[PDB]
Design a protein around this ligand. Sequence first.
Ligand code: MN
Ligand code: MN
Lengths: 234, 234
Amino acid sequence: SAEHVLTMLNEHEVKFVDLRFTDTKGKEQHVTIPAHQVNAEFFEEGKMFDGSSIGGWKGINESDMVLMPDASTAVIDPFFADSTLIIRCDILEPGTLQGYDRDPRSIAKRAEDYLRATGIADTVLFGPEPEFFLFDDIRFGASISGSHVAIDDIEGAWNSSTKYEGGNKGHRPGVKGGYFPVPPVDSAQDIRSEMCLVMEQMGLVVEAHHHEVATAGQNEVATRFNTMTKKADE
Amino acid sequence: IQIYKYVVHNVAHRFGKTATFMPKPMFGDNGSGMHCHMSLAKNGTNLFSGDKYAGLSEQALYYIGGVIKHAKAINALANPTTNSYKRLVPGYEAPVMLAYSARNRSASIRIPVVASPKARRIEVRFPDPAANPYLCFAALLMAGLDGIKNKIHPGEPMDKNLYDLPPEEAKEIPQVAGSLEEALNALDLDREFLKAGGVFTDEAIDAYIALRREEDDRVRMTPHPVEFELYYSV
Ligand SMILES: [Mn+2]
Ligand SMILES: [Mn+2]
């Protein structure tokens, strides 16, 4: 609860509350609130902003259901303490529910809870396995006259020939061959290892991490299953 | 050929370029090869003609025989410097089969269509721009007729490109002696059909071998860029 959050607020000092909050038809968003301003009312009636990303004709302000005031935690990363505390869409408004032209987190639940009103069952678990790429430089652009993009990261075969100064040192994974081969060759762990620590710190549960299969920094971190709404937000 | 070459090298150079008869300058492209078409004639009659398979004649067949018989020893003569064989890599495109066809390439002996028996011939393609047309031609011939000579018989043409349960005796199937050392060897043993007539002393043969030998060495003792590619980080 808030009563709670409330402590936590003092538990840690914290000021500001933000990073990750709304999240688009696409993905992730935030706004920052001075530490005060939080207080029940806040917990009970929210805060509201407006449109931008899906919205038509003027002024559709949307309540920001300061919510899942569970889904609340100290973000490592930001400077000065602050409780990243999601929000359950903008609820709507006075009706108070599906954020304008979405409420992805809402839809989530409608679904979820709707599920529940069928009887087909009671709880749906989702355990996604998302992989990601970790590179060094990413340059690209496009324009009347041309277009392009370039990717680089010590690793990705390509780089062998490449001259450095501390110079080459040549251990790296060649095209579909980033296969848990031990270090010298493994851009590195510490980045993963590390990501886990924080992942859990943030509150997820890690199950194992490792290098996927790609010449230039394909990394995977696995995370224990959940409930759509939770996992999704995880 | 000796001129054909001098002229190329030269205009080529006089134009602004370097010209090179190497068989496989680059990888994944086409490395020039010297096909050699041939036929012998008596008076103004090419005893290579007749009936029996694609025009042609008994006579020819022993020839088709001859080559096929000492193919290896020949390519030691008409396929030097190592590079030679980086072209004579099993293709399907690449003519490493010891058969004859009028198609079904892969087939190292092509009896081109004909028309006028007036010009019926044999194209043995495998030889590469790198041989003393002298030795090469000689050895081509020299054999050709030892076949023509003591019977020796082709058997049937291919017309069934390589590709047959790879093994499925397609494996069994006679090969163009791909690989110098190997080729070098053949010649060491084949001596004979060369040696015959005087066209070829033991020496000649010896000396020859003896030479190609060195290069073959320099080549294998010197470690290769790729080896690092694959073998380095072990
Ligand atoms: Mn995976
Ligand atoms: Mn030709």
